[PDB]
Amino acid sequence: IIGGTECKPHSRPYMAYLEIVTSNGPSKFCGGFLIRRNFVLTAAHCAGRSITVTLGAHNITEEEDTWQKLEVIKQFRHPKYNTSTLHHDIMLLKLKEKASLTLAVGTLGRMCRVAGWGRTGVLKPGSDTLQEVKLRLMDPQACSHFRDFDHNLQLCVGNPRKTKSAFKGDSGGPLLCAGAAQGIVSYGRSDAKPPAVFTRISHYQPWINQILQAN
Numbered sequence: 001i002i003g004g005t006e007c008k009p010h011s012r013p014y015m016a017y018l019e020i021v022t023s024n025g026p027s028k029f030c031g032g033f034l035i036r037r038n039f040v041l042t043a044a045h046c047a048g049r050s051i052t053v054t055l056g057a058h059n060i061t062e063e064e065d066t067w068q069k070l071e072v073i074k075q076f077r078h079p080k081y082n083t084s085t086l087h088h089d090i091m092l093l094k095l096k097e098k099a100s101l102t103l104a105v106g107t108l109g110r111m112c113r114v115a116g117w118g119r120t121g122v123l124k125p126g127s128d129t130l131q132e133v134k135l136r137l138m139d140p141q142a143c144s145h146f147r148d149f150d151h152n153l154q155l156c157v158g159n160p161r162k163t164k165s166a167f168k169g170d171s172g173g174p175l176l177c178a179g180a181a182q183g184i185v186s187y188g189r190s191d192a193k194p195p196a197v198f199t200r201i202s203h204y205q206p207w208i209n210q211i212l213q214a215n
């Protein structure tokens, strides 16, 4: 998160910190959010050979009683996910067991908010702590320069005159507008100049319901 502020610990209890394991490289990291006690939503580009989810975290370097480290049994990447266009960049993760509900862990031109443990600058490392930033929902023409941007499938997010943005490491985090999840962090420019492109959740509701009933 670039240009955000540190959250009060555990004030976003649905936030999930994902460690993504692959066969041929070191761990990668994403965000995500708990939507059922045994399901996390995140970005499809966060798929890997295996994933571990940490719920209840604030400072992810400092283990505490609020932490629930949970195994992911199965990944459900959207079947239409396309690595060339980044269309349908959404994935459900089924947890091996249902998470415990605690104070710190629970399920989930207008201004929206997005949180994450991602980089706080183009050249800066991932944040130790959960950060959040407020971003402006833009008209789709603001994202025309992303040639594969599609207004039906995606939101255009972030005033180009501000430096505020989600960034690397924030993948999969929910964009909330009026306390309701509207988007999921997907992609943006490598130089972090806003706006960025978020998945439009509403488009994926039937598919999400589909997976949630089948598993």
Ligand SMILES: CCC[C@@H](CC(=O)O)n1c(=O)n(Cc2cc(Br)cc3c2CC(=O)N3)c2ccccc21
Pocket: 020, 028, 029, 030, 045, 046, 165, 166, 167, 168, 169, 170, 171, 185, 186, 187, 188, 189, 190, 191, 196, 197
């Ligand atoms: C497992 C995460 C892989 C990393 C690797 C990378 O940064 O290229 N990653 C990652 O962190 N993001 C999110 C991202 C990347 C960049 Br560059 C800019 C922005 C984002 C989100 C955003 O709002 N801007 C990715 C979006 C698409 C594909 C890979 C992505």
Ligand SMILES: *[C@@H]1O[C@H](CO)[C@@H](O)[C@H](O)[C@H]1NC(C)=O
Pocket: 059, 060, 061, 062, 128, 129
């Ligand atoms: C996070 O925790 C580590 C280890 O306790 C500590 O070194 C670091 O200062 C903490 N970061 C913040 C911002 O609290």
Ligand SMILES: [Zn+2]
Pocket: 009, 010, 058, 064, 066
């Ligand atoms: Zn705590």
Ligand SMILES: [Zn+2]
Pocket: 080, 088, 203
């Ligand atoms: Zn679709």
